[PDB]
Amino acid sequence: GMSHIQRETSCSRPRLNSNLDADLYGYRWARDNVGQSGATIYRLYGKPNAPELFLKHGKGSVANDVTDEMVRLNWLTAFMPLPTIKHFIRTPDDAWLLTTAIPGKTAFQVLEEYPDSGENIVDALAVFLRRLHSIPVCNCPFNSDRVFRLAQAQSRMNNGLVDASDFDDERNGWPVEQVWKEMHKLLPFSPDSVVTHGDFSLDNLIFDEGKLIGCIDVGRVGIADRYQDLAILWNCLGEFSPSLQKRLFQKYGIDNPDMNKLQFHLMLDEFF
Template sequence: MAIQVMEARPDIRDAVVDAIAAFLRRLHAIPVAECPFDSDRAYRLIQARKRIDTGRVDVDDFDDEREGWTVEQVWKTMLDLPPFEPDPVVTHGDFTLDNLLIREGEVTGCIDTGRLGVADRYQDLAILWNGLGHFGPLLQARFLQQYGIAEMNWDKLRFHLMLDEFF
């Protein structure tokens, strides 16, 4: 998995990040009309609310920025973010370093595709960007540059990071 390679081989982190960015660009280039699964904002919000209402959200697993927050605090803060125009692509849905298979510095596959579907590209960008943060801001910046993001939409990023807290 990519996380294991990143931890064990600091000397190839740049190459791995470049390979991940190239893989994600290819995934996001799949025509949305060819994907039968919908995972857009409305769908994900409904699923998140169901998880909240049935007590299936693990508050102990919240990111450091939301440590000590209640589920309802995250929900309200997320919904209070400014609205944004969606940029629909075919997304993995849980694009973490744990879900990417790496061999010899190349992405050879991905696992845990249960949330795959058409959604805003920041669904994947936010989750990966967050994971790369464990290795420092230089790798995060490299990923964005290699993927082709000239300027991060911080509100979209925050929205998708908070949305991910519910899953």
């Protein structure tokens, strides 16, 4: 061959991409996350022969967040059912992410609507989580390991960003610094690393026609201990019953739940 190739030719302007102000055309609009942490979100609906869309707009540091979800959406969709990216734009202070909506209701909503199906619903969740954790880690370009997350948590703590009102019952009213200190007493342990979602909660898994058809909110996707996802989902199931909590582990394939790793990941999520 031949190296250090830097060969220039004259060219006319290429054909540029169709703009954002085009995909979104005939739609209704609604802000769905008023007062929350993160982007402005627009629900676009009501176009004949066109699917429902969401458009996230992040400004400043939140633009980095939206950019983070976009690349993770792009990567993970080869393995899992996710919203498809219709259009994404990054400028120096803004990011815009246009995605298709996944029809259906959240796992939380389905559990509430179908309480007599709790056990079948948890079975579906475990199968879906097993599918995610079966993606070979060698395929994943994203790091979500505990060293990375612990540094993010330290930062949020030092910047006053930890929501101390939202701690689990067993840490109710604890100072953030106490959670930090006690959490470190669970370390170290050997990670059992898999492709994790990062916020595998009942709000982020979508059911339609009785089947688990997708997951959303993938900005924290990356390689981490499997308990990162087990802990968050186990926690949510506590709003329903301890039997369903137990069932999650059993159906996922863990007979002997590692209480230390469970506790560690529950505590880590307090900071986020």
